[PDB]
Each structure stands twice: as C-alpha cells, then as structure tokens.
Short mmCIF file of all heavy atoms in Angstrom, two decimals:
data_model
loop_
_atom_site.label_atom_id
_atom_site.label_comp_id
_atom_site.label_asym_id
_atom_site.label_seq_id
_atom_site.Cartn_x
_atom_site.Cartn_y
_atom_site.Cartn_z
N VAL A 16 0.80 -1.20 0.01
CA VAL A 16 -0.03 0.05 -0.03
C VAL A 16 0.88 1.18 -0.04
O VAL A 16 1.53 1.55 1.05
CB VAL A 16 -0.95 -0.02 1.20
CG1 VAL A 16 -1.65 1.30 1.30
CG2 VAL A 16 -1.87 -1.16 1.20
N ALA A 17 0.84 2.04 -1.09
CA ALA A 17 1.61 3.14 -1.21
C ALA A 17 1.18 4.28 -0.40
O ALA A 17 -0.04 4.63 -0.33
CB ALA A 17 1.67 3.50 -2.69
N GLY A 18 2.11 5.06 0.32
CA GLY A 18 1.81 6.03 1.00
C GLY A 18 1.23 5.93 2.39
O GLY A 18 0.79 6.84 3.05
N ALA A 19 1.30 4.61 2.82
CA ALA A 19 0.74 4.13 4.05
C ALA A 19 1.48 4.79 5.19
O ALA A 19 2.71 5.04 5.05
CB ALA A 19 0.67 2.62 4.14
N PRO A 20 0.85 4.97 6.38
CA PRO A 20 1.65 5.33 7.62
C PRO A 20 2.68 4.45 7.86
O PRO A 20 2.61 3.26 7.61
CB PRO A 20 0.46 5.43 8.66
CG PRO A 20 -0.72 5.67 7.99
CD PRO A 20 -0.61 4.91 6.61
N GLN A 21 3.74 4.79 8.63
CA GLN A 21 4.94 4.09 8.89
C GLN A 21 4.53 2.99 9.79
O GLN A 21 4.89 1.81 9.53
CB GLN A 21 6.08 5.03 9.56
CG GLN A 21 6.54 6.05 8.70
CD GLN A 21 7.36 7.07 9.31
OE1 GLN A 21 6.91 7.84 10.18
NE2 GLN A 21 8.72 7.08 9.01
N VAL A 22 3.90 3.26 10.89
CA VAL A 22 3.45 2.24 11.84
C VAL A 22 1.96 2.52 12.06
O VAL A 22 1.62 3.47 12.50
CB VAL A 22 4.11 2.15 13.21
CG1 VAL A 22 3.53 1.13 14.14
CG2 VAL A 22 5.66 1.99 12.94
N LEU A 23 1.10 1.40 11.57
CA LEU A 23 -0.29 1.62 11.66
C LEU A 23 -0.96 0.57 12.45
O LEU A 23 -0.96 -0.65 12.05
CB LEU A 23 -0.82 1.65 10.25
CG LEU A 23 -2.40 1.80 9.98
CD1 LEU A 23 -2.89 2.93 10.79
CD2 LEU A 23 -2.59 1.86 8.53
N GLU A 24 -1.57 0.86 13.52
CA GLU A 24 -2.38 -0.10 14.30
C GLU A 24 -3.83 0.02 14.17
O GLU A 24 -4.35 1.15 14.05
CB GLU A 24 -1.88 0.02 15.86
CG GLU A 24 -2.46 -1.01 16.71
CD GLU A 24 -2.13 -0.78 18.14
OE1 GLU A 24 -1.30 -0.08 18.49
OE2 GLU A 24 -2.78 -1.49 19.09
N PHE A 25 -4.53 -1.06 14.11
CA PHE A 25 -6.01 -1.05 14.04
C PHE A 25 -6.61 -1.77 15.22
O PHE A 25 -6.08 -2.84 15.78
CB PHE A 25 -6.52 -1.74 12.87
CG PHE A 25 -6.27 -1.10 11.50
CD1 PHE A 25 -5.17 -1.40 10.68
CD2 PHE A 25 -7.09 0.02 11.12
CE1 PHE A 25 -4.90 -0.83 9.50
CE2 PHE A 25 -6.83 0.56 9.77
CZ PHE A 25 -5.80 0.25 9.14
N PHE A 26 -7.70 -1.27 15.73
CA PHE A 26 -8.36 -1.96 16.91
C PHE A 26 -9.98 -1.65 16.89
O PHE A 26 -10.32 -0.80 16.04
CB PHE A 26 -7.89 -1.36 18.13
CG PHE A 26 -8.30 0.04 18.61
CD1 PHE A 26 -9.07 0.14 19.78
CD2 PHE A 26 -7.93 1.08 17.91
CE1 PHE A 26 -9.60 1.42 20.10
CE2 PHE A 26 -8.35 2.40 18.17
CZ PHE A 26 -9.16 2.47 19.40
N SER A 27 -10.69 -2.27 17.77
CA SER A 27 -11.99 -1.92 18.04
C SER A 27 -12.21 -1.91 19.47
O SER A 27 -11.57 -2.74 20.11
CB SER A 27 -13.00 -2.84 17.33
OG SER A 27 -14.34 -2.64 17.81
N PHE A 28 -13.01 -0.96 20.11
CA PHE A 28 -13.29 -1.06 21.50
C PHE A 28 -14.14 -2.28 21.91
O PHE A 28 -14.27 -2.57 22.99
CB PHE A 28 -13.99 0.23 21.85
CG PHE A 28 -13.06 1.44 22.07
CD1 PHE A 28 -12.98 2.43 21.21
CD2 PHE A 28 -12.01 1.44 23.00
CE1 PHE A 28 -12.15 3.37 21.26
CE2 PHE A 28 -11.20 2.50 23.15
CZ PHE A 28 -11.27 3.61 22.14
N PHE A 29 -14.68 -3.01 20.83
CA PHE A 29 -15.44 -4.27 21.06
C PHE A 29 -14.56 -5.49 21.01
O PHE A 29 -15.07 -6.65 21.39
CB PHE A 29 -16.52 -4.40 20.02
CG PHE A 29 -17.73 -3.55 20.25
CD1 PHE A 29 -17.94 -2.36 19.64
CD2 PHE A 29 -18.64 -4.07 21.12
CE1 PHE A 29 -19.12 -1.67 19.76
CE2 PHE A 29 -19.83 -3.41 21.32
CZ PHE A 29 -20.09 -2.20 20.72
N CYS A 30 -13.29 -5.46 20.74
CA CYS A 30 -12.47 -6.35 20.43
C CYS A 30 -11.70 -6.90 21.62
O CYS A 30 -10.99 -6.17 22.34
CB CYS A 30 -11.42 -6.04 19.28
SG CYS A 30 -9.80 -6.84 19.11
N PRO A 31 -12.05 -8.19 22.11
CA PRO A 31 -11.43 -8.56 23.44
C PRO A 31 -9.96 -8.62 23.35
O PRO A 31 -9.26 -8.21 24.37
CB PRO A 31 -12.05 -9.91 23.57
CG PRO A 31 -13.20 -10.06 22.64
CD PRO A 31 -12.96 -9.13 21.63
N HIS A 32 -9.30 -9.06 22.32
CA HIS A 32 -7.83 -9.23 22.30
C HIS A 32 -7.17 -7.68 22.26
O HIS A 32 -6.18 -7.60 22.69
CB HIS A 32 -7.27 -9.96 21.06
CG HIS A 32 -7.53 -11.44 21.21
ND1 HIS A 32 -7.69 -12.34 20.16
CD2 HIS A 32 -7.57 -12.28 22.33
CE1 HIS A 32 -7.94 -13.52 20.50
NE2 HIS A 32 -7.91 -13.53 21.86
N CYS A 33 -8.00 -6.83 21.65
CA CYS A 33 -7.55 -5.39 21.67
C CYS A 33 -7.59 -4.77 23.16
O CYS A 33 -6.76 -3.87 23.44
CB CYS A 33 -8.44 -4.50 20.90
SG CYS A 33 -8.57 -5.20 19.12
N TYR A 34 -8.54 -5.12 23.93
CA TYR A 34 -8.54 -4.77 25.27
C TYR A 34 -7.28 -5.35 25.98
O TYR A 34 -6.54 -4.53 26.76
CB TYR A 34 -9.80 -5.27 26.03
CG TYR A 34 -10.12 -4.88 27.37
CD1 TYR A 34 -11.14 -4.04 27.70
CD2 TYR A 34 -9.31 -5.28 28.48
CE1 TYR A 34 -11.47 -3.58 29.00
CE2 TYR A 34 -9.60 -4.82 29.89
CZ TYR A 34 -10.59 -4.06 30.04
OH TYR A 34 -10.93 -3.49 31.42
N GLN A 35 -6.87 -6.56 25.79
CA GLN A 35 -5.71 -7.15 26.20
C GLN A 35 -4.43 -6.33 25.74
O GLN A 35 -3.63 -5.95 26.51
CB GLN A 35 -5.60 -8.69 25.92
CG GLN A 35 -6.65 -9.45 26.42
CD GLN A 35 -6.55 -9.39 28.07
OE1 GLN A 35 -5.59 -9.41 28.65
NE2 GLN A 35 -7.89 -9.36 28.70
N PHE A 36 -4.43 -6.18 24.39
CA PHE A 36 -3.27 -5.43 23.82
C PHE A 36 -3.05 -4.14 24.45
O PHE A 36 -1.89 -3.65 24.70
CB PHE A 36 -3.54 -5.26 22.35
CG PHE A 36 -2.84 -6.11 21.41
CD1 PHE A 36 -2.79 -7.54 21.82
CD2 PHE A 36 -2.24 -5.74 20.27
CE1 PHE A 36 -2.10 -8.47 20.94
CE2 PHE A 36 -1.62 -6.62 19.46
CZ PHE A 36 -1.50 -8.00 19.78
N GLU A 37 -4.18 -3.27 24.72
CA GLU A 37 -4.01 -2.01 25.11
C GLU A 37 -4.02 -1.86 26.60
O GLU A 37 -3.20 -1.09 27.19
CB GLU A 37 -5.21 -1.17 24.45
CG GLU A 37 -5.15 0.29 25.02
CD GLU A 37 -4.00 0.95 24.75
OE1 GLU A 37 -3.15 0.63 23.73
OE2 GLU A 37 -3.66 2.02 25.29
N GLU A 38 -4.94 -2.70 27.31
CA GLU A 38 -5.11 -2.38 28.72
C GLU A 38 -4.22 -3.33 29.64
O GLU A 38 -3.82 -2.89 30.72
CB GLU A 38 -6.57 -2.56 29.15
CG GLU A 38 -7.63 -1.81 28.38
CD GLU A 38 -7.43 -0.35 28.61
OE1 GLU A 38 -7.36 -0.02 29.71
OE2 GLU A 38 -7.25 0.38 27.64
N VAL A 39 -3.77 -4.37 29.02
CA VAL A 39 -3.03 -5.30 29.89
C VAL A 39 -1.47 -5.44 29.37
O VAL A 39 -0.53 -5.42 30.20
CB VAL A 39 -3.59 -6.76 29.88
CG1 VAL A 39 -2.76 -7.61 30.79
CG2 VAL A 39 -5.06 -6.56 30.50
N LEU A 40 -1.29 -5.51 28.06
CA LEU A 40 0.05 -5.75 27.48
C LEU A 40 0.68 -4.37 27.19
O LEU A 40 1.90 -4.24 27.06
CB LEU A 40 -0.15 -6.49 26.24
CG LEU A 40 -0.71 -7.96 26.41
CD1 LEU A 40 -0.92 -8.71 25.04
CD2 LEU A 40 0.35 -8.82 27.37
#
C-alpha cells in the first residue's frame, strides 16, 4: 500500500484481544 503510515495499528473497542493489547500488554 503506497503512502501508508509508517506504523499503523487497528483496533475496536469491542475487540477482546484489543482490550488485552491495550489495557494489559
């Protein structure tokens, strides 16, 4: 993907593993 951000993270506030990624890890 041309012109994409250098480091790009995606999440959802509904996503259980995302809660772990952000709130615990």
Side-chain angles (χ1 to χ4, degrees):
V16 175
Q21 297 170 290
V22 180
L23 177 49
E24 183 181 347
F25 293 98
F26 78 112
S27 169
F28 286 109
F29 280 99
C30 160
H32 288 150
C33 305
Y34 188 110
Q35 295 302 320
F36 260 41
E37 176 62 21
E38 303 296 312
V39 181
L40 300 173

